[PDB]
Amino acid sequence: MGSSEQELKAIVKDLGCGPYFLGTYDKRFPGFVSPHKLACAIVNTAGRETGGVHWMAFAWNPRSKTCYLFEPFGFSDQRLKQVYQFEYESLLRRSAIASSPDRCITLEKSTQSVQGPNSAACGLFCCMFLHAFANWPQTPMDHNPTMNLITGVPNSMLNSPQVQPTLRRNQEQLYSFLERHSPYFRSHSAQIRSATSFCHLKNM
C-alpha cells in the first residue's frame, strides 16, 4: 500500500533493473531457475493472504553462482525465523538444483542494518540495492557508488540512541537517490516519504 505498494516495480523499472527483475513475491517465492542470466526479486516475509509485513531482496549471479540476500535489518536467520516466521531454506535448495551444475551455491547476506527500527522504508531500500546489483553484480553489498551512500550498523545496535542519526541520514540519502533516478518517485515524493517515513511505526 502506502509503505511501498507492489509498485516497487515502477521504481525498480525506473532504476534500470527491468531486464533482470522477476517481480515481487510473497514468502512462497520458489527460487531461481536461471543458470545463465542475472535475476533478482523483491520478496515479502509473509503470504499474500496476510497483505505483507517485510520486504527483502534476492539477487542471483550465475557467473559466480552466488545468491544475494539483502534484508534491510541484517537480522540473523534465527531472528528472521522468530520475528517474521520466514525461512528461505526451500528456495535456496531449489535455486541450487535448478541453476547450478554441481548443485552448490554461495549465499551472501547482509549482517548489518541500514534501516531504523520504526521506519517503513524497507521496500525502497531493496530497490536501491537492486540498482547496485544490476550495475555491480560482483560487489553489490558495499564498495560501489550506490551502496557507499548508506552506512550499515551492527544489528545489535539497531535500537541504540546513538546510531539513530546514521539511520535517519541513510534514509535521507535513500530518498534523494530515488529522487535523482526515479521519475515515478519524483512525481510521488510526498506520498511515498509520508507513507514510508523514518518514524512511521513509532509506538504511541
Partner 1 sequence: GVQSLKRRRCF
Out of 28, 79, 81, 93, the residue judged to bind partner 1 by CB under 8 A: 93
Residue with cell 545463465: 36
Cα separation, 179 vs 122, in Å, equals 17
CB of 41 to partner 1, least distance (A): 18
Angle, CA of 55, 12 and 163, to the nearest 5°: 50
- 147 makes contact with partner 1 (CB under 8 A): yes
Out of 108, 135, 175, 188, the residue judged to bind partner 1 by CB under 8 A: 108
Nearer Cβ to partner 1, position 148 or 176?
Answer: 148
Per-position DSSP letters for 158-197, written without gaps between them: TT-TTTHHHHHHHHHHHHHHHHHH-HHHHTTHHHHHHHS-
- Contact between 46 and 52 under an 8 Å Cβ cutoff? The reply is yes
- 16 makes contact with partner 1 (CB under 8 A): no
Out of 45, 80, 99, 109, the residue judged to bind partner 1 by CB under 8 A: 109
Among all residues, which ones are annotated catalytic? 54, 71, 122
Coil/strand/helix, residue 43: strand
Cα separation, 8 vs 19, in Å, equals 15
- 92 makes contact with partner 1 (CB under 8 A): yes
**Closest C-alpha among 28, 85, 88 to residue 60:** 88
Out of 144, 164, 166, 173, the residue judged to bind partner 1 by CB under 8 A: 144
CB of 104 to partner 1, least distance (A): 4
- 127 makes contact with partner 1 (CB under 8 A): no
Q: For 15-86, where are the alpha helices, taking DSSP H only?
A: 77-84
- 106 makes contact with partner 1 (CB under 8 A): yes
Out of 8, 42, 114, 126, the residue judged to bind partner 1 by CB under 8 A: 114
- 74 makes contact with partner 1 (CB under 8 A): yes
Residues that bind partner 1 (CB under 8 A): 66, 70, 74, 92-93, 96-97, 102-112, 114, 141-144, 147-148, 150-152
